[PDB]
Amino acid sequence: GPHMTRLGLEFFDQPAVPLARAFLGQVLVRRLPNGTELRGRIVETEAYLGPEDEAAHSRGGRQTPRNRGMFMKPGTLYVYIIYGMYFCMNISSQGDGACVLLRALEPLEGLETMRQLRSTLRKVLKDRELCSGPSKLCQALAINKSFDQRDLAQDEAVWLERGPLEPSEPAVVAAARVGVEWARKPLRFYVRGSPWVSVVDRVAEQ
DNA sequence: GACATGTTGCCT
DNA sequence: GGCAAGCATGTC
Ligand SMILES: [Mn+2]
């Protein structure tokens, strides 16, 4: 096989917007306790800018017991429970209270384990339903709160390997964020034409 | 203590 | 497309 490295501090240490864009095409890897490796290529992200960003948990520089990952070194995971039953996986970027939400993956390896984790553990699921959402991907990759405040550059259960297929400048759609002035600002980024994206913005494309 | 707020699967 | 169940969390 190929000599496989992992993306380190050099990659994670950049402003939220650049990082959110740079994530596109990269491959998120999860190794389960049973030895099974799961792989998914990132196709959709969101940038949360910090104290000025009225949609971010760090708005006005607010630091709570929950959002501490956002104020820790670039690469630190911020995993929180939303709607009492779902997880959102964020990665701290460079900049006070700034992070990036992972929204969607193209599933590449371990799809049958993903389908079990998505259906057998809670509530035939098509391949498109596996990772097409921030909380869907957390379920499919077995991400929960025990992953909160871990370092994505150093952790032996979850890492980021560099992807062979990365989009260039014109292939990236900058659109409004999902479920959030700061509601309308284009801080969501996804691969144009990808069937694995959670929500298509047909207005921000045309 | 109260209570407002924050994605997915089904349904309209 | 619309619609809330879900309960963790933050705030008063
Ligand atoms: Mn509700």
Q: Where along chain A do its domains lie?
A: 1-206
Architecture field, domain A1-206: Roll (3.10)
- Taking the C1' atom of B10, which residue's CA lies nearest? A123
Experimental method of this PDB entry: X-ray
Q: What angle do CA A158, A67, A198 make, to 5 degrees?
A: 60
> Which nucleotide across the nucleic acid strands is nearest to A123, CA versus C1'?
B9
Resolution to 1 decimal place, in Å: 2.2
CA of A123 to C1' of B12 (A): 22
Q: Locate tokens 């957390």: which residue?
A: A138
- Taking the C1' atom of C7, which residue's CA lies nearest? A84
Q: What angle do CA A127, A143, A42 make, to 5 degrees?
A: 50
> Which nucleotide across the nucleic acid strands is nearest to A82, CA versus C1'?
B6
Helix/strand/coil for A151: strand
Q: Which nucleotides of B are covered by protein (CB under 7 A)?
A: 6-10
Contacts of A34 (CB under 8 A, 6+ apart): none
Contacts of A80 (CB under 8 A, 6+ apart): A57, A66, A67, A87, A88, A90, A145, A148
- By CB atoms closer than 10 A (0-12, 13-18, 19+), residue A157 is middle
Contacts of A38 (CB under 8 A, 6+ apart): A29, A30, A31, A32, A109, A110, A113, A114, A140, A141, A142
- Taking the C1' atom of C5, which residue's CA lies nearest? A83
- C-alpha distances out from residue A53 to A59, A61, A183, A184, A204, Å: 6, 10, 9, 12, 21
Q: Are A45 and A172 in contact (CB under 8 A)?
A: no
Q: Are A38 and A29 in contact (CB under 8 A)?
A: yes
